[PDB]
Amino acid sequence: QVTKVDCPVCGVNIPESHINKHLDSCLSREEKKESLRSSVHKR
Amino acid sequence: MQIFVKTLTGKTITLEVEPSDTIENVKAKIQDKEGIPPDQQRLIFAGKQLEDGRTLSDYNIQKESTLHLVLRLRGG
Ligand SMILES: [Zn+2]
C-alpha cells in the first residue's frame, strides 16, 4: 500500500514507510542545535 | 487532564491522562482505545519525541493539548 504523511517536526512530504528513518534524522538535527553536554569528561 | 491525539491519517482520539502519568503509561491507555501495540506507537510533541521514562508534566504539557501519533511498522 502506498501512502504519504507530513512531518510534524519539519513538514516534509514522505511515505509512511520512510517516515521512521526520516524521524530518526529530523530528531537528530534537534539534538545538534541544542548545546552538547557530557556527564563524564571521558565520555 | 483531557488531551487530544491526532494521527498522521487525520483520525482524532480524546485521551484522559494525568501529568503524573508517564509516557509509557499513556501508550498502554491508547492500546485499549486504538488496539495498536505501545511499541509500534511513537508520540511527538513540538517536533521532539516523548521519552517513555519521562512524565507529561516534565514536557510542560497543559490541559487539552494536541499530540502527534506516528506508527512504526518495522525497522527491517
Ligand atoms: Zn522532518
Residue of A nearest to B48 (CA): A27
Cα torsion angle, B34, B38, B42, B43, sign: positive
| A35 DSSP 8-state letter | P
**Which contacts qualify for A33-39: CB closer than 8 Å, 24 or more apart?**
none
Whole-angstrom distance, CA of residue B55 vs CA of residue B36: 21
Alpha carbon of A18 to ligand 1 centroid (Å): 11
* Backbone torsions φ then ψ of B58, nearest 5 degrees: -70, -20
DSSP letters of B23-76?
A: HHHHHHHHHHHH---STTEEEEETTEE--TTSBTGGGT--SS-EEEEEE-----
Whole-angstrom distance, CA of residue B19 vs CA of residue A15: 33
The answer to whether the CB atoms of A9 and B48 lie below 8 A apart is yes
Q: Which three cell numbers stand for residue A7?
A: 512531518
**Cβ-Cβ contacts under 8 Å, B65 against chain A:** none
Q: Which of A6, A9, A16 sits opposite B47 (nearest CB)?
A: A9
**Cβ-Cβ contacts under 8 Å, A26 against chain B:** 47
By C-alpha distance, which of A5, A7, B35 is closest to B27? B35
* Backbone torsions φ then ψ of B33, nearest 5 degrees: -85, -45
Whole-angstrom distance, CA of residue B41 vs CA of residue A29: 22
> Quick one: residue A22, left, alpha or beta (phi over 0 = left, psi -120 to 50 = alpha)?
alpha
Whole-angstrom distance, CA of residue A17 vs CA of residue A1: 10
Task: Confirm or reject contact between A17 and chain B (CB < 8 A).
Answer: yes
- N residues, chain B: 76
The residue assigned the cell 482520539 is B13
By C-alpha distance, which of B24, B51, B49 is closest to B38? B24
**Cβ-Cβ contacts under 8 Å, B44 against chain A:** 8-9, 23
Q: Which three cell numbers stand for residue B24?
A: 509509557
Obtained via which technique? Answer: NMR
| B9 DSSP 8-state letter | T
